[PDB]
Amino acid sequence: GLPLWMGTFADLMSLLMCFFVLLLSFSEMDVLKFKQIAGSMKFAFG
């Protein structure tokens, strides 16, 4: 199988995902920064 530290790591990461989704749910993204990030990501992926 896998070591149990992997399970603890997965649970902690899912918990932090939930918390960060909550944090972002009441935050506004800068449109210019998001456009720059989108362009860089599109260039990186082909």
């Binding site: 993204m29 449109v31 990030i37 989108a38 990501m41 599109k42 992926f45």
Partner: protein, 230 residues
């Protein structure tokens, strides 16, 4: 209280199935799972496993009580079941004890092997479903990252990709693994039934006392997972 537990189980399965139902997401999971499984089992064996699962989920096993009653009523005297009919025909045709024992034990081993193969196929499906769901989720993530246009379309789009993972989990813990577990339970039940038929047929052919064979049948009844029912 039994009705309450049955209702809660049915309601849980219904709500989880409605969460399952939404077309492509399940399709990637099932296609990947089928492709990975076919490296271990030929399509004929997979279809045989599905046949066995359907027969186990649609046809109830014959309870040991009616089998014991029928065996003892033939013993005192001297039918819908298939294996018992075959054994009865085998002894009435006229044969030694050893050949009948070998034939019925071969049939029992064949049933055990078939049920074990079905259990293995569905356990392989359960093992490989979540990994393929995760692969589908990662491909969806790549697509959404390569099509980054609107911030307000980040939430839902990601929620679609992650959806695939969910399906894998729902297919792994609520479909394939439960079917494998039910197949194992059906294998144990059918092994017990066939062993009881073995004992009864051997006693009838050997002309043993019906009381001792009745005690033997009760003793075989009082063991196994049934021990909790007493």
């Amino acid at each position: 209280l039994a009705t309450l537990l049955g209702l809660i189980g049915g309601f849980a399965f219904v709500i989880m199935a409605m969460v399952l139902g939404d077309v492509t997401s399940i399709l990637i999971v099932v296609g990947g799972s089928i492709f990975v499984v076919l490296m271990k089992f030929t399509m004929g064996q997979f279809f045989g496993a599905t046949k066995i699962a359907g027969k186990a989920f649609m046809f109830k096993a014959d309870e040991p009580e009616d089998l014991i009653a029928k065996i003892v009523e033939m013993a005192d005297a001297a039918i819908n079941n298939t294996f018992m009919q075959k054994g009865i025909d085998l002894l009435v045709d006229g044969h030694d004890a050893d050949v009948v024992r070998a034939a019925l034990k071969k049939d029992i081993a064949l049933t055990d092997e078939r049920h074990t193969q079905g259990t293995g196929v569905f356990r392989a499906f359960g093992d490989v479903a979540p990994a393929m769901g995760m692969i589908g989720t990662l491909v969806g993530l790549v697509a959404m990252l390569s099509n980054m246009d609107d911030p307000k379309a980040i939430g839902p789009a990601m929620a679609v990709a992650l959806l695939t993972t969910l399906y894998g989990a729902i297919l792994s813990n609520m479909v394939f693994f439960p079917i494998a577990d039910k197949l194992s339970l059906r294998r144990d039940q059918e092994t017990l039934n066939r062993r009881l038929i073995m004992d009864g047929v051997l006693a009838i052919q050997d002309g043993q006392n019906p009381r001792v064979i009745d005690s033997y049948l009760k003793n075989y009844l009082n063991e196994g997972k049934r021990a909790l029912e007493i």
